[PDB]
From a paper:
Neonicotinoids are a major insecticide class, displaying high selectivity to insects over vertebrates and have been widely used in pest control. Neonicotinoids bind to the orthosteric sites (normally occupied by the neurotransmitter ACh) of nAChRs at α/non-α or α/α subunit interfaces formed by seven loops (A, B, C, D, E, F and G) in the long N-terminal, extracellular domain. Of particular importance are the basic residues in loops D and G, which contribute to the selective actions of neonicotinoids on insect nAChRs. In an attempt to clarify the divergent mechanism of dinotefuran's interactions with the An. gambiae nAChRs tested, we cocrystallized it with the Lymnaea stagnalis AChBP (Ls-AChBP), which is not a nAChR but has been widely used as a surrogate for LBD in nAChR interactions, since no insect nAChR has been crystallized to date.
In this experiment, we employed the Ls-AChBP Q55R mutant as it mimics insect nAChRs in possessing the basic residue in loop D. Dinotefuran bound to all five orthosteric sites of the protein as observed for imidacloprid, thiacloprid, clothianidin and the nitromethylene analogue of imidacloprid. Of the dinotefuran stereoisomers, only the S-isomer cocrystallized with the Ls-AChBP, in line with the finding that the S-isomer was more potent than the R-isomer in binding to the housefly (Musca domestica nAChRs). In the Q55R mutant of Ls-AChBP, the guanidine moiety of dinotefuran stacked with Tyr185 in loop C as in other neonicotinoids. The nitro group interacted electrostatically with the Arg55 in loop D and Lys34 in loop G, confirming that these basic residues in loop D and loop G generally play an important role in the selective insect nAChR−neonicotinoid interactions. The non-aromatic tetrahydrofuran ring is a unique structure of dinotefuran not seen in other neonicotinoids. The tetrahydrofuran ring oxygen formed a hydrogen bond via water with the indole ring NH of Trp143 in loop B and the main chain carbonyl of Met114 in loop E as in the cases of the pyridine/thiazole nitrogen in the other neonicotinoids. Nevertheless, the tetrahydrofuran ring hydrogens undergo CH-N electrostatic interactions, which are not seen in the crystal structures of the Q55R mutant of Ls-AChBP in complex with imidacloprid, thiacloprid and clothianidin. Also, the guanidine NH of dinotefuran did not form a hydrogen bond with the main chain carbonyl of Trp143, as was the case for clothianidin. As such, the structural information supports the unique experimental binding interactions of dinotefuran with the An. gambiae nAChRs, with the caveat that the AChBP is only a surrogate, albeit useful model of the nAChR LBD. The protein was cocrystallized with 1 mM dinotefuran in precipitant solution composed of 16.5–18.0% PEG4000 and 0.2 M sodium citrate (pH 5.4) at 20°C. X-ray diffraction data were obtained at SPring-8 BL26B1 beamline at 100 K using a CCD detector RAYONIX MX225HE.
Residue numbers in the entry:
A (entry chain E), E (entry chain B): 0 to 207
B (entry chain D): 1 to 206
C (entry chain C): 1 to 208
D (entry chain A): 0 to 209
């Protein structure tokens, strides 16, 4: 009968926080999905928005796996004990303020789930925020230092309901969210960095 | 035993990253907010900036010692202890802990952590300037531990969350009610227990 | 013996996380604020932003060394020492410590810690612009140690008040009075000793 | 049979973050190049600008080298494991806010690439920002403590589009960027500190009108 | 023969960051000199200024010394590896924001040079800032915990241009800077703390 302590100790002994856990020469498949919680500050003049979102991050490290028939199937682990993908929002203009305890969930099969609530300010299109059509703010998120052969990022294919966890008390409302995959290259070099482009279509609530 | 020995033993047997479940039962965390001040309120953005003592209580029996011929209680830095990963679900700033980050550990293994916190929330501020006042609901629960691992309960002390509130604030508290809740997410089957603190307050005067 | 030996010995025998109670008696902490500046005052919100030296004095006999043929006093980083967990009960910001975080330790084990602090409080600012001025009450005591473990006493040596106060502030100090108190909470039986500092101040250069 | 694990372990064992990796007694050649991403806040009165830029930093540390015949030729490494040039913007008036994960890329030969996205406020000439000619804000960046014999700084010859990665959503636009080398000495002492002077010619966007 | 690595290793082994490096029982001679780079914000009413300056700090630690006939005569060292004087600006109302890499320069003889660029806000006389004569803002800087017998502070009097490194783009200009030695004592106690008093004579540009 394994206990939570044994599970953590095993993770510590095999997990290498600064070493990407590539199997063979294949990329690590990171799933990335934003659930928007609040839109706090919007500036149509500067084209800047301040947003709060849960950044659901999923990937696999099979070296962490254990046998969970007669033991817990999942444990909470501080991210300092784990390798974590070096995700960056490419159009952010502030560092991400992580609001929640920095713990990830590891499952007996080796799936890791890290989902911090983040508050961050972005440069994006705020034109039309006070119209019926609303504004569309595009947020690009991907690895900062790992190219397509080392990390691939994919939008999760979950749920669908956009305003599901969104504050009813915000001054804004969400019309639609669409998450699509992209791939930026830099003229310096031949490698491609995969990203997810989250399109946030929102507008001021108005009237009453 | 000397207080040094007690602390050394706590260090050596405490596991800050390991939830101290007895058997297969959840850890019973008691959570109670005592509001001290309301600093900033915005009826338009529905945001409040509040200061509150977050009284947090739970058991870790591995910490226990024999306190017949020794002190029954010590102050311990939380970095030496497992601490529940509580989050305010509708907070829009990180909690600014104002006070020394020490908890109190009793010889039986009861822990009491009560930081003074300043934090900004998204909640209903409509009616803050009326007789009825506004009702701001703050939900607080574990971020990563579900109902089988952590349960949160509003302390059986159902006394005044007032009585500690600044007389010098521009606002007044009408009522505070602390209730248990249990949220689930459509992705998954697990439930996260929370306490929902309903703060009914209003601006002082006309 | 030299300053290096003194520090090494302090490290070996000092226990920063162990309150140095002699017998079962409380540690007698002396607490005294010298106000240096009043920066910002708000009659509407009842908030003040102040800078003050928080003179803190206590005894830790475990620190003691000889000092016939060695220095009688050293500057020691507070991380090497037990330090009382003082908190201002009506503060609304964390104390911003402006000065190097060193205490002074004497060979007998007397400790003097005196950081310059900038901190914001919730207190009575009514009447700040009158002849009588406002009286802002600041309560400071241990956060986790009750009356049997820590006692706090005002050292009121003496009543000079404006002695170190900035001549360049827009406010002036009329009087400071430091008195002892003892708060209890209805949940629980323990009493927490505090010092209540009454700051009587007013805007300079009034009409009457 | 760990591979990237072995690489990192070996870097830890032989890397000295506090030791400048001079080959012989020659200076370390640090290449420094800004790509401007955003201009956030501009004040013609105070002569202050708030800018976001990628600071492409390149140098050689042969102590990091490994043999990559039967292993990966490149890894991402946290900068705390590496010596990193002590670059400062001389006319900055805020600390650099690093926005991106603090990882550098190390190649098996010991070439290092560190490229943080930085947000920082500067004191520079903002006069004329609202004219056709725009303002020219000069940002000076060099080692803080290493003189010309220990660190040399060279502007890369990217020589490309200036507005290439610049936000279309900024209120400002870039007219031209020119990166040139300089070399300042102080009256106290005989040593010279090499820097790069980045001249940002920008202006408020026109009209939107018709 | 010996290399930068050896030099640093030796510094680590023999340096004691928390131990003042007094030779015999004589004070450590700290030289302190401000070069003003910018004046960012001034408030005539509150008597507050926000300034940026290089704080050139010089002292001797002979325990650090090495050979250097067949090796480098100087190295850059992180200050966390060194003892550093606990200097404080006595009339500061913000903590010093250090803008530059926190490295000092150590010479083979044991001379240390630490020169951080600092941005800090002070309480000083801003009266007359908008006149031809300008204001004179006095900044006092000295040890916080080490008295005259342990640390002495002396102005480097390098007879130079004051506005040499000062921003041409500031709204203010410097008329004169004068650095003189002083010595504060407190009524509680007999010990004297040596300081340097930096007198910044400056004024708003233009408007005439
Ligand atoms: C793959 C594997 O071995 N899984 C095991 C199973 O065989 C065993 O019944 C149980 C008790 O050890 O733990 C699990
Ligand atoms: C040039 C060099 O040093 N590279 C070596 C290579 O010669 C050798 O075949 C291989 C296996 O040990 O390791 C690597
Ligand atoms: C510890 O406590 C138990 C429980 O009452 C008691 O029986 C035992 O004698 C104690 N042991 C000592 C003296 O440490
Ligand atoms: C300390 O100093 C006293 C001074 O007289 C001396 O008697 C003693 O032997 C010294 N050594 C100890 C025990 O600290
Ligand atoms: C430094 O080392 C060299 C070794 O070649 C020696 O000749 C020299 O005298 C040394 N310096 C001193 C003064 O010890
Ligand atoms: C709060 N939301 C949640 N799932 N969801 O929204 O789909 N799971 C809890 C996460 C488990 C690990 O970090 C938090
Ligand atoms: C964003 N630009 C990029 N390359 N470039 O511009 O030439 N690479 C990402 C960097 C690779 C190493 O650190 C981050
Ligand atoms: C100051 N308040 C106090 N009790 N109370 O408020 O009910 N006790 C100290 C707290 C309990 C242990 O951590 C801090
Ligand atoms: C800026 N001034 C400078 N020299 N000077 O002023 O004479 N050197 C850089 C310093 C070298 C040691 O720490 C920083
Ligand atoms: C500045 N004021 C002072 N005494 N006083 O004001 O009564 N002592 C310096 C202290 C020595 C230990 O920490 C600072």
């Amino acid at each position: 009968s394994l206990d939570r302590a044994d599970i953590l100790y095993n993770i510590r002994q095999t997990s290498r926080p600064d070493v990407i856990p590539t199997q063979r020469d294949r990329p690590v498949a990171v799933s990335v999905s934003l659930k928007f919680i609040n839109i706090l500050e919007v500036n149509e003049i500067t084209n800047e928005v301040d947003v709060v979102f849960w950044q659901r991050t999923t990937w696999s490290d099979r070296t962490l796996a254990w046998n969970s028939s007669h033991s817990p199937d999942q444990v909470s682990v501080p991210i300092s004990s784990l390798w974590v993908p070096d995700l960056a929002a490419y159009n952010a203009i502030s560092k991400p303020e992580v609001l929640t305890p920095q713990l990830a969930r590891v499952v007996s099969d080796g799936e890791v789930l890290y989902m911090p609530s983040i508050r961050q300010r972005f440069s994006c299109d705020v034109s039309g925020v006070d119209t019926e059509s609303g504004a569309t703010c595009r947020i690009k998120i991907g690895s900062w230092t790992h190219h397509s052969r080392e990390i691939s990022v994919d939008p999760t294919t979950e749920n669908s309901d956009d305003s599901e966890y969104f504050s009813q008390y915000s001054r804004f409302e969400i019309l639609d969210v669409t998450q699509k995959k992209n791939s930026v290259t830099y003229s310096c070099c031949p490698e491609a960095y995969e990203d997810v482009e989250v399109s946030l279509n929102f507008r001021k609530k108005g009237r009453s």
